[PDB]
């Protein structure tokens, strides 16, 4: 009688999730360092706080700090379940980071490793962390960054008499660069684990204090008059993405939007515009050059960080060489600043272009989001998304055609994805939001909008591709790198790319061909030809007159 | 239909027993030390083994050792289940103790803490440890002790010209005293966790090598011509107890007894006799006096150890003061030898008498066991258990009556339990083993046997107690300490001693009265009067003739 049902296991080992979390803390190790993070904190003392104690988390004067962390971890494993063990660790390590930070004399070497350890605590089980702990941790990291006021506020250019006679120390600069970078990365981590909660509970996180604190630290990160640290720019726009993504995908959308003032947005969007109008050039990414025009990713902060691996991690060997590893000390091991830098590969510049192109994709992606938040007209969906986005579209087509085609870099495709993306940021702005596209602001970009749409409608002629035989001879010229990519994907990393059945590689000699069309800047996708057609041709606004329009059409044929 | 059965739990949290074992290792702390054992091993390096590696247990030259222990513990938690995690730890820490030990120059400070950590590993779940690991660990601790050849072999008396001009260092002596004491305690622990296995599997432990190695180390512990360390005498007779206890309570009893040669027993029993004929005197327990007559428990090895808390732990403050606790070192922190010893309480002497009386109870308890092993006659159940046990019975009655009655020590009762026990070691020797009680050896003790039995049969007169009113006036004289004991037991530590229902304290004014009878050396228990009667009166052997017997009976009445 019903001999079908799947039988249970009578000895189900539900794994002790707090033990797995304990083990994930104990062997947490940042990428490039020689020792584990707890094993670094065992080698740190603090000799100006004579006795630290918050809630039975006693630290003696000459005691190792990581001894006290592992004593807390062992002591609170027996007692607490997981969601209490998390916020116990969060508030205890937060109070420790706090009184190491606000002190006149004491070195702050434990602070980066405690922030990274805190990030390991947060993102272990995001379903387990209650969001009031996330609120407390977010407020603590925001006013922790406003403690570290001076890392993101170095001036543009120094004095001419700034004599570089100096010990040329890097270890304190390396400490507070790690503090700022791990802090902004922890802000990104708090908001994605808050993003992963069920969608009825976001109001337990947000209040006025959250948004005012992030407004301050967001003005701090996306700087104007100071040297930009690009490591914090990635996370500081990814946080804005997480905000605009949960505003879309929640139910009580008004009480976020009522909590946000329009000044927050019109301070955010101008800095996003000023980020979007910067240049990406591989030959002087890592060079130090003119400000606020090239996203440059400085030599003196080049390491991975917590979420994503952003550079080549040139300063990861110096994290392990910041402590003496056989000694219990407080001041750092001395790192000379001018030893780094040795010249063999510009490929590092290509992948840093790849990250910066994903950054611009991120910025106009959150443009695409907050079009959909404020579908009705407001202060902020206000026509300058024609000006700045059309400037961006026109120049990233123009110097694509002038400079990039036939340069065999791997970053062509994504760079001709951005234009392919930002036309859509034009298009639904044109189609669904014309009621705020004012008559003067359209004439601020009448050159560049019409020229950018014309470089899509030039591709309806198509006397270039038309076959198969010579297009692969074009991709031997422009797209050999993606041939290497797809052969290494086909022979190693894809399940469907073996014993190819004479329909899966006819798809390949369809899609590599349309890809190399989209790279060669002739024959874009037909859907984008239609979207560019129904802005220029359509009669929502006289971009051109009919005797000016056919002056454009004769330069293709027509 | 059958709404009775107890329902299961659908979310049974079977606790991750290897995680609990991990946490028991990580907060293992010996009694009196300031730091945890892993936290002491984090402060130890080893600078003569340039690189230690056995099976991916890499230790660098200047690295902390406890870093490598906790790296093994975290790495082998994910992989192994519990019975493999145990013997992985056992062989790895054993190889580490080995190559720290066999080295000419290197200090051995890590060795006591690694042995104590190994003991914590063994006795956590004794059902989990497979007994081949116990065999390997027992063989390793036995040849580890024969490495430490010279701790248990200091001479009796030094030269007259042994000038005590010397650094007077104690730290190296404290190290290898801890090594020897923790090693013998680990031998006791291995054999009780082997005792706790199901009784069909003892042959997986024992072979010739086990018994030859313990024969050597047992001759080493119960010394003859060297200064005795009493800490190893307790465990070295408790091991013999565990052996003679499992020989009784197993099924394949012959293949142990065939594996044991009679020379092992007739080397063991002579040393047990020589231990049994020593004296216990509180006024010179802790004094240094004449050898092999007083069990003295020397001042320079007075700490707890692993199983039992044997002294007052005067050398436990010096275990934490053996390392610098803010430093990674190899040589010990210097302990001056003559600072210890400060005189306030002889009560410490009374509880050390209590432990030594339990030691003599242990020795004649294993006499009582191996009567029952060799119920048939052999080399070893051979009539000297009349001589030595009757010497012991007669003197511990004689100087009981001359010296101990009315001395208000807590150790009277157990001291008049020993006589009350050892009569039984007489009695079943007399009744069930007369066929080896040879005619000359009985006349070696004809004085002492008959006098000892007569001091039991003198109690059948009993004109002393006979009531209730004056016997409590006797226990105000001899047994006030047990009145304090039973009042503190009655008001604090016993569930049945409140709202006393006038039958539970009539039992008290029965059993305190028979107890103070048994202390006052008049009116023993009636069963012991019968057992002493049916040796003297019964006609198995002419102890007395009938004209010599009534010469004894007239000195009671009769």
Swiss-Prot record, chains A, B:
MF GO annotations: damaged DNA binding
Cystine pairings recorded for this chain: none
Gene Ontology CC entries for this record: ATR-ATRIP complex; cytoplasm; nuclear chromosome; nucleus
Modifications after synthesis and translation: Phosphorylated by MEC1 in a cell cycle dependent manner and in response to DNA damage.
Tagged with keyword Mitochondrion: no
Top-rank taxon: Eukaryota
Main location: cytoplasm
Subcellular locations according to the entry: Cytoplasm; Nucleus
Keyword match DNA-binding: no
Keywords: Chromatin regulator, Coiled coil, Cytoplasm, DNA damage, DNA repair, Nucleus, Phosphoprotein
UniProt GO BP: chromatin organization; DNA damage checkpoint signaling; DNA repair; establishment of protein localization; nucleobase-containing compound metabolic process; regulation of double-strand break repair; telomere maintenance via telomerase
Assembly, per entry: Forms a complex with MEC1.
Note: Present with 606 molecules/cell in log phase SD medium.
Function: Forms a complex with the serine/threonine kinase MEC1 which activates checkpoint signaling upon genotoxic stresses. The MEC1-LCD1 complex is recruited by the single-strand-binding protein complex RPA to DNA lesions in order to initiate the DNA repair by homologous recombination, after the MRX-complex and TEL1 are displaced. Required for the recruitment of MEC1 to DNA lesions, the activation of CHK1 and RAD53 kinases and phosphorylation of RAD9 in response to DNA damage. Required for cell growth and meiotic recombination.
Name of the protein: DNA damage checkpoint protein LCD1
Shown chain mapped onto the complete sequence: 186 to 747 of 747
